[PDB]
Design a protein around this motif. Structure first.
Motif, PDB file in Angstrom:
ATOM      1  N   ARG A  62       0.817  -1.218   0.000  1.00 63.11           N
ATOM      2  CA  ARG A  62       0.000   0.000   0.000  1.00 63.11           C
ATOM      3  C   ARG A  62       0.852   1.269   0.000  1.00 63.11           C
ATOM      4  N   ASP A  63       2.048   1.191   0.586  1.00 64.70           N
ATOM      5  CA  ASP A  63       2.966   2.327   0.634  1.00 64.70           C
ATOM      6  C   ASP A  63       3.924   2.393  -0.563  1.00 64.70           C
ATOM      7  N   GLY A  64       3.754   1.514  -1.553  1.00 65.35           N
ATOM      8  CA  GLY A  64       4.481   1.610  -2.831  1.00 65.35           C
ATOM      9  C   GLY A  64       5.648   0.660  -3.056  1.00 65.35           C
ATOM     10  N   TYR A  65       5.779  -0.364  -2.222  1.00 72.27           N
ATOM     11  CA  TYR A  65       6.720  -1.443  -2.481  1.00 72.27           C
ATOM     12  C   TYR A  65       6.000  -2.545  -3.247  1.00 72.27           C
ATOM     13  N   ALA A  66       6.688  -3.176  -4.190  1.00 74.90           N
ATOM     14  CA  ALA A  66       6.230  -4.464  -4.706  1.00 74.90           C
ATOM     15  C   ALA A  66       6.716  -5.564  -3.753  1.00 74.90           C
ATOM     16  N   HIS A 312      10.223  -2.093  10.128  1.00 77.31           N
ATOM     17  CA  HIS A 312      10.632  -2.649   8.831  1.00 77.31           C
ATOM     18  C   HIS A 312      10.480  -1.620   7.706  1.00 77.31           C
ATOM     19  N   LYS A 313       9.361  -0.900   7.690  1.00 78.90           N
ATOM     20  CA  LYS A 313       9.120   0.081   6.626  1.00 78.90           C
ATOM     21  C   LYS A 313      10.139   1.211   6.705  1.00 78.90           C
ATOM     22  N   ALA A 314      10.427   1.666   7.923  1.00 79.40           N
ATOM     23  CA  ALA A 314      11.453   2.696   8.157  1.00 79.40           C
ATOM     24  C   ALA A 314      12.830   2.222   7.679  1.00 79.40           C
ATOM     25  N   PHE A 315      13.149   0.975   7.996  1.00 79.48           N
ATOM     26  CA  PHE A 315      14.409   0.352   7.615  1.00 79.48           C
ATOM     27  C   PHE A 315      14.537   0.256   6.090  1.00 79.48           C
ATOM     28  N   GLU A 323      16.074   7.309   1.982  1.00 82.08           N
ATOM     29  CA  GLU A 323      15.555   8.334   2.885  1.00 82.08           C
ATOM     30  C   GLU A 323      16.435   8.396   4.123  1.00 82.08           C
ATOM     31  N   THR A 324      17.394   9.319   4.101  1.00 79.14           N
ATOM     32  CA  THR A 324      18.509   9.294   5.044  1.00 79.14           C
ATOM     33  C   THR A 324      18.110   9.454   6.511  1.00 79.14           C
TER      34      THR A 324
END
Ligand SMILES: [Cl-]
Ligand SMILES: [Cl-]
Ligand SMILES: [Cl-]
Ligand SMILES: [Cl-]
Ligand SMILES: [Cl-]
Ligand SMILES: [Cl-]
Ligand SMILES: [Cl-]
Ligand SMILES: [Cl-]
Ligand SMILES: [Cl-]
Ligand SMILES: [Cl-]
Ligand code: NA
Ligand code: NA
Lengths: 574, 574
Positions: A62-66, A312-315, A323-324
């Motif tokens: 949903r956040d744009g990863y396949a 996990h999403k942040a990582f 995204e530094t």
């Protein structure tokens, strides 16, 4: 926004022409995206089975990863023949290469998943594929001998082997092209193993496995037949290659999980060369609820799947999307500290200020049973003593909690009182504590031992004794004496000779609160967590019960034989 | 084939203009399809949280069903204000109507899901929407007074109420537009309730709930303030309308699930007018593993999610796709029969040949405690006796297993030995059985009772005593004496007068094997499964502990007062 599609059974060709099946979860928006891969031997379609032990990963889509979920070779929709571990390095490399070629992949790939879905990530990481930017191995190992099949002590993890083999066997049969007449009966027998893993493990010779050896020859051909950490094991080991990697890894472990020692060792191996993160909860492999029969850790201990998803999403945002600042405020290490039963952030593992402190075995009289005289103290014992017991392979000490996987693997912090009356369970305890003592780190014992046999085992278990009498298991290990110096080139012992041996007791995090005691149990068996030593020096898995021998085993303690447990003491006053 | 898409946050307008959010899982192939709807108050995005207790429903989507998952009014992506139950009939009707209008709906709609996601299906079924062709309510109720909030005995299910309210409160806060300063502290306090539900339930007056009453006023305004089964409860009850429906229902229940009595009653209500199916496993609401602290039912008892998925698909194929042979070979009723610990197919519930058999309370001396003289026999007792005890609301009998939902709700078949020494626990047992006795059906007791108070409770619990001494709970109930004749129009009792009262003990399926005993415990409390009677005749939830009274309670047994449990005996020889 949010919208995605799912494409089923896309066939991916491996270097040898065999095609593995994948499902593709792809955001509907145009333009290539970062991609996450999961390699799964338990049916890529069956996402609910494993995902509750991992992440709410549809949030990633949903956040744009396949997300790509693959059936491993020879299972479910994939072609080829299944054999554990041996094809996963090459198949991962070829799958990653295929992903990176696709129109919808932006050149950044990661992985996540638990247990077998974690091991396969280390196998991918050693491939040298530059497009793999990060992994997230949960409940995983990079050394399959050390976990889950044997251990640092050189004993076979027999319940792990028979349980997993029965589970996979049930899958192997379900995967079948066409139903066979014998399938129904095979299902019944596999269920019988899973309902009574200790019973299955008690058959002798252990290496004779008519059902499991037929369904999965590997069980015997690789695992049971190679008790030494030999060339066959090194060929699938990743661990020595980890030091050379520079791949970010988000590593999750559980204090009562079969893989814990090896999970933690992977963190230590990779932390210096890349951004490694560690999360450790009080979980066993089949119980991530935080609730056990005689020990409750609180609702905060329940596997925090929302927070895990966020982390996990942040990582992945940091390492796949560049995204530094994505990991701002995220701790390097996050541990569930038992006793106080609270999550706590740390800057490293091992903890920076760990005082590795010997607690010496002592006491007047015999330490046999919980009502013996066995003591633990930071002072060396003043008088030379020895505790003696008979270890009979026909009556091993039963496994209770700890890092059991399939045999009663849902009660890690088990009350040990049911085995306290055994003469072959030596108990040593501190006085009742007036101030808290924190033990957080790797744990080991150094024991001075002797035996009437030319081989035997010694076990050590750390236990938190509660005010009400509950004796709660924390961590444990074993040393099989032929492997006391090396897992690779074993040698026998001389009967009656005293040996100083190390027992690797994995790791824990526990505050022993006021009113508690620190306790250690010492024995020579822990079955079926580990197979039973025959006390013969023979090929243990090939021996009949009746050709095994009893052993009179001895623990020496005193000034010249200062047997002890080494506790990783953390002292915090602020 | 297989391929599908997922559209997020499609807004569906209700009759009052408020829009509820849905996710649409739609097969990629052209042409309209049958549709399945799930109405969920725990975030439609969070599919992993509930689905492992239901079905692998992505199989339905892969097989050509559309699936719609909706956020209920006032939660997560939906507009409006959340109040339990009161909007779900209308919102379901309007949602079904919207689905039926869509280009991708072929005019056939079904529903599935568990607990709240099951109750909402009965609320949908009474809507009169012809396009709704089938429902599959798991762990559900059509009478919210009878389950989960009160019960057939007229006692408040206080742990169910406080636990669920705390859970929803955590969701209500997470659903917030904008984070509030008090949110963090509220989370902490909600966690404190969930970690100690009995503690939360022990506060007096019960009706004073500063946190829960603020977050969800309904907790007090509806539930605690309406102890009688009055007009407020009838307004959300569906049960009386079920008899007029002709909607196929695939009903799942669990022997240790809080909703079980009401789940089973829905089957009985609908079976004559439509194709009803029943599946009952040995599960509690938070434990569908088949494994408990002192009781293991075998791997076959683990919630059979694959088989459930197959059965649901067959059921929907029959009723939504008109495949007339789709349920060939599928049993009407399928029960997990405990003791023998096996699944077994039946043609009806109640079972056709059920012998409702009185087992009379008897014995020489006092039946107080498990070491008293209490007996059970199919013969009426020959001598008039009475067992007496003091019931003190400050020291109620603790709930252990049974149909607990949130307070220790993961150990249904709990060993009762910890409460056997209590003087207020009266025990009556058969002799040790030499032949098996099967009890499968609804269970009730008829007790002749008296009290020193003008109101009190009586409880009855059926127990299987194992050879090793484990006393495993099976089913239980309560009667609050003011509601002995009616839940609607209570009246007080006269102190010292003998009343014949019925206790609804829900249902079970158990074979008491040779070497076991059948046992019944009788008392006057079971806390916090049920709130404690104050023994005053007052408004119980408004009373301080110190204004409650003790009661001297009496069970009369003999020829003129033949107190008994009625067991649904099944005898099978073939
Ligand atoms: Cl505890
Ligand atoms: Cl907590
Ligand atoms: Cl915490
Ligand atoms: Cl000493
Ligand atoms: Cl305690
Ligand atoms: Cl059992
Ligand atoms: Cl079974
Ligand atoms: Cl069965
Ligand atoms: Cl009698
Ligand atoms: Cl028994
Ligand atoms: Na681990
Ligand atoms: Na139920």
């Amino acid at each position: 926004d949010c919208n995605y599609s799912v494409a089923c059974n896309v066939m991916v060709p491996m270097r040898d022409g065999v095609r593995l099946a994948v499902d593709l979860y792809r955001p509907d928006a145009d333009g290539p995206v970062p991609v996450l891969l999961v390699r799964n031997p338990y049916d890529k379609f069956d996402v609910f089975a494993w995902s509750t032990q991992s992440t709410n990963w549809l949030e990633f889509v949903r956040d744009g990863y396949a997300v790509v979920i693959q059936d491993t070779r020879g299972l479910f929709a994939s072609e080829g023949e299944f054999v554990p571990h041996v094809d996963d390095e090459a198949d991962a490399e070829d799958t990653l290469s295929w992903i990176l070629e696709q129109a919808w992949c932006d050149g950044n790939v990661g992985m996540f998943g638990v247990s077998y879905l974690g091991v396969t990530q280390w196998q991918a990481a050693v491939s040298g594929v530059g497009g793999l930017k990060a992994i997230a191995p949960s409940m995983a190992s990079a050394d399959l001998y050390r976990a889950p099949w044997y251990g640092p002590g050189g004993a076979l993890s027999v319940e792990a082997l028979l349980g997993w083999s029965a589970l996979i066997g049930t899958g192997l049969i379900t995967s079948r092209s066409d139903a066979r007449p014998e399938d129904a009966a095979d299902f019944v027998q596999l269920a019988a193993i899973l309902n009574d893993v200790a019973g299955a493990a008690s058959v002798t010779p252990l290496a004779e496995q008519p059902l499991l050896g037929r369904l999965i020859p590997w069980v015997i051909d690789q695992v049971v037949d190679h008790p030494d950490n030999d060339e066959s094991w090194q060929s699938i080991s990743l661990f020595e290659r980890l030091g050379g990697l520079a791949t970010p890894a988000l590593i999750t472990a559980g204090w009562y999980d079969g893989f814990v020692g090896e999970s933690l060792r992977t963190f230590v191996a990779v932390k210096d060369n890349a951004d490694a993160r560690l999360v450790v909860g009080p979980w066993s492999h089949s119980n991530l609820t935080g609730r056990n029969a005689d020990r409750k850790f609180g609702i905060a201990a329940t596997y925090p799947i929302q927070e895990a998803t966020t982390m996990h999403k942040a990582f992945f945002d940091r390492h796949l999307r560049g995204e530094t600042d994505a990991l701002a405020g995220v701790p390097k290490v996050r541990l569930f500290v038992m006793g106080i039963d609270e999550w706590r952030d740390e800057t490293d593992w091992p903890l920076p200020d760990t005082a590795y402190t010997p607690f010496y075995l002592g006491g007047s009289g015999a330490a046999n049973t919980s009502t013996g005289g066995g003591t633990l103290s930071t002072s060396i014992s003043g008088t030379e003593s020895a505790d003696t017991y008979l270890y009979d392979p026909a009556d091993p000490v039963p496994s209770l909690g700890g890092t059991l996987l399939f045999h009663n693997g849902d009660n890690g912090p088990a009350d040990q009182r049911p085995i306290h009356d055994r003469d072959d369970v030596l108990c040593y305890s501190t006085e009742v504590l007036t101030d808290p003592v924190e033990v957080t780190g790797t744990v080991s014992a150094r024991l001075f031992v002797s035996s009437s046999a030319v081989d035997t085992d010694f076990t050590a278990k750390l236990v938190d004794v509660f005010p009400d009498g509950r004796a709660i298991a924390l961590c444990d290990g074993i040393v099989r004496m032929r492997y006391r110096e090396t897992l690779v080139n074993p040698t026998l012992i001389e009967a009656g000779e005293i040996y100083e041996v190390a027992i690797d007791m994995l790791a824990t995090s526990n505050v022993f609160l006021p009113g508690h005691r620190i306790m250690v149990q010492v024995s020579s068996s822990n079955f079926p967590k580990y197979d039973r030593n025959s006390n013969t020096g023979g090929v243990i898995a090939r021996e009949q019960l009746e050709e095994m021998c009893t052993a009179v085993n001895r623990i020496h303690r005193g000034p010249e034989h200062p047997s002890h447990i080494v506790l990783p003491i953390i002292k915090r006053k602020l």
